[PDB]
Structures are given as C-alpha cells and as structure tokens.
C-alpha cells in the first residue's frame, strides 16, 4: 500500500507531459526528439601493446521538435524566415517533464544556443485523417540535464 508521496520519489516519470520554452515564449509542441551528448574516441596503440583510449572531440547536436499548425499562429516559420546570410536570432530551449497541470517541474533539459534549419511543411494528401503537422530541426550545442 504505497502512498502518493512515495510514488513521486521512487517511481519513474513518463514522457507524455512536458513543456517547451523557446527563448522567452512557451510554444506547445507535440514531439521533441534528438537531443544527446556525444563524443568521439581517440585510440593509440604502441609496440609492446598498450591500447590507450581517450574521448576526443565533442560531436554536434541537432534536435528535432514537432508541432501541428494552427490557424493564426505562425511561430516556427518566422524563425526560419528571420535568417539572412550569416546569422539568426539564436534562442535557448528548455524542455522539462512536468506534473499534470504545469505547477511543478520534475527534470529539465537546457539547450544553449539554438538556431533553426530544415523546417518541413506538412504533407498534404486527401486520403488521410491527419492534422497538418510541421517540424523544425534546429542545430545547437551543450545540452545539459538539470534535476528539479
């Protein structure tokens, strides 16, 4: 007979309830995926036999976060339209698994300097019951994972 306060400290947390904060805005997305922390490896072997392994260069980070379109809101396009030649207004993304209503955060992922590439417009077909869903694949650096 476990109580509801032991569940909140022992049991793991599910993916289906999270909030995303793009810069200073809160945009409700459908699926955020593709954030990770990768490194490459350097090997060095010599003669008598010493298999030295060191982690080397930090590898790039591009996350892919997906949203249905809405009749008035055009938010992801004016970020992929804002880019002239060399610079975008880079924002920071905070993802955080929440409570049922968004009154508590449970674990938070912070993304440092994010600029968008590859906005994909929806796939129209007259035989599908889907919602018109678009995605944005923004490249960034330094995903950190913060408790509470």
């Amino acid at each position: 007979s476990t109580s509801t306060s032991q569940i909140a400290v022992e049991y793991p947390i599910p993916v289906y309830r999270f909030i995303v904060s793009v810069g200073d805005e809160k945009i409700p997305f459908n699926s955020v995926s593709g954030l990770d922390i990768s490194y490459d490896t350097i090997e060095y072997r010599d003669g008598v036999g010493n298999w030295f392994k060191m982690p080397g260069q930090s590898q790039s980070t591009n996350i892919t976060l997906r949203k249905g379109v809405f009749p008035g809101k055009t938010e992801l396009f004016d970020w992929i339209n804002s880019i002239q030649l060399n610079q975008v207004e880079k924002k920071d993304i905070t993802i955080s698994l929440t409570n049922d209503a968004g009154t508590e955060l449970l674990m938070t992922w912070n993304v440092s300097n994010a600029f968008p590439t590859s906005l994909t417009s929806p796939s129209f077909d007259a035989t599908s019951n889907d919602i018109a869903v678009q995605e944005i694949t923004l490249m960034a650096d330094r995903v950190i994972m913060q408790a509470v």
Binding site: S21, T94, S96, G102, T103, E104, T108, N110, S112, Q146
Partner: protein, 352 residues
Amino acid sequence: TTVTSYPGVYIEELNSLALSVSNSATAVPVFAVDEQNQYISEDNAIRINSWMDYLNLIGNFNNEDKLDVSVRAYFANGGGYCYLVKTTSLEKIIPTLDDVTLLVAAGEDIKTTVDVLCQPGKGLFAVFDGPETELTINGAEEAKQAYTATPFAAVYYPWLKADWANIDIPPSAVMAGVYASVDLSRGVWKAPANVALKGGLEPKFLVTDELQGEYNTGRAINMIRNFSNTGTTVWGARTLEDKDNWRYVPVRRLFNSVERDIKRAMSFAMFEPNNQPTWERVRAAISNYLYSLWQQGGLAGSKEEDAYFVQIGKGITMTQEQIDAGQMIVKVGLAAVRPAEFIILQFTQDVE
C-alpha cells in the same frame, strides 16, 4: 556646411577639424559639466555619439575649455557614446538614465554626489581625479583622506598634458577611454592598467616608484607614468577600499558588468506567474549566461562547479511569506580573477 545648388562636386576647405574615428563598445561615461558652460542646458542630458557630433554642438574647437580638451582625449583613446550632464543636476539625471556604467568627473569635484549616488544596488563605478599639484611622500596622509573610502571609485593622480592643448588634461577623461578600449579587446576581467595612452597624451609630473609605494596602500591612488620601453601607460588597478572583496577595479567592474547583463538576461520574468516553472526558466537563463562568461576566461577555477552557482527554490532561498509578497530571491556566486601586482626577481650569482 555649404548650401548645395547644382549637382556636382564642391571643393570647400575646412582647416583643422582634428577628426577621429567612430567607435562602438559597452562603456558609457556620464561626463560632469561645469555650470559656466553655455552649450549645455541643465535638467537635460545631451548625447554625443562621436567627435563630429560634439564638434557640431560647440561649433569650433578651442584648447582653453576644461571640457573641450577632456572629450577629445576621450574619443582619441576609446570612443563610445557619452552623456554630457551638468553637475548641479547630476543627482536627478543619472538615476533617470539607463546605460550608465561609469561616472566621470571631467574636471570637477563630485565627492559629495558619489556618496549618495553610488550604492550597492546601483550599477555605477565612478572615476575621479587626483590632485593637480605635486604630492610627495610626506603628504601621503593628507591627500589620501581627501576622498571617501567607497569601493565604487578609482583615483588617477598625474594630470595629463598634450601638444594640442594649453590647459592640463584631467586623467578621468582618458581613463574612460581606456576602460572602453580594454573591455573590447581583453574583456572586462583584465586590468585596465599596463596599457598605452594614444592621442599624444603625456603626464605632467614625473612619478618615482618610491613615491607610489605610499599611495597604493589603503585609500589607493592609481598613477600613470612613462617608461623607457613603451612610453606613457597606466600603472594602477586598485579601487579606494582596501578589503579583499573589492580591492581591484577588475573585480568591481566585472561584478558591475555581470549584474547589468544578468538583469537584462532574465528581465522576461517580470509580472510572470510566480510558481515553480518560472523559477527553473530563471535559473537556466542565468546559468547559460555564466557558462558563456566561464568559457571566455572571465572567472577563476577549472570546473563549472567551482566557478559559479545559481540556487533558487522555495525554502532554499525564499520563504512562503516571500511568495505572496511577490518576491523572487536569487542567490548567485562568482569567483573572478585577481591580477599579479608584484614580480620579484632573485639574482643568484653562483650557478649550480
């Protein structure tokens, strides 16, 4: 300015404009202006974007005015847009003005104003001048206590002289150019001493090292002096207070350059619903500012957990009675770099 009638080229001369290049930085000197100046109105702060914009205001340049030789030496060294405020209304206009990071006594006495103006809550760092007479080892106790002991001020003694000027040039003019020329090149955390003076500026009085040994202790007076290798240079990086928390100006100027860029980094949090998802959006807006300051070498240490810390939360730093009063208390810590003032050289004669 000539009127234009026909489309073409006009060959009109204008002798000796003494033209300087426009510069962009983040250091904004409020210039105190003596009350007998005519091209200023009080309870008003006019803005000077470049040397041509000041020269548009006064019309033509003369080396008699204590202000005219002041802003030339400012734009010859560092540049950046400055605010010309008259002294008798300077207590009303500086709290009014945003973009104020350092208050320059041009050639005037501001010691009564800085005591009420410069506070721990504000973001200023005033600079003013030493005495314009020669001062010796014997008069080290008299002129040192002529200033207050606040950690938000720096004093530069030797007044300048230049070939293009007649009146002596006050050193808080050039030291606001130096503060703006070093922050662009080496960042804020490096000391604004050990840097050259441009514009043909030269010190009036020669300073020995045994003279500077008495004006570095306590209420310190930084001094500029010329050397054989490089020429004239700044040779002080101490503020007025001599406690180890705020002893060096790069420590005091970094913490003042941090707070003005934290409070604009998390100014989105105003009038937001004060619950928990506002808080972690605040601790993350600070933490990837301080990390970007960490990687440039601004803080001391080696890890990101000896460098800084941001800790907020209910009960960690704020009580429940602070929630319904509308208060978010944030605790941030920093560990800046200290400069190397002394280098001693031990000369053994017998090599092993």
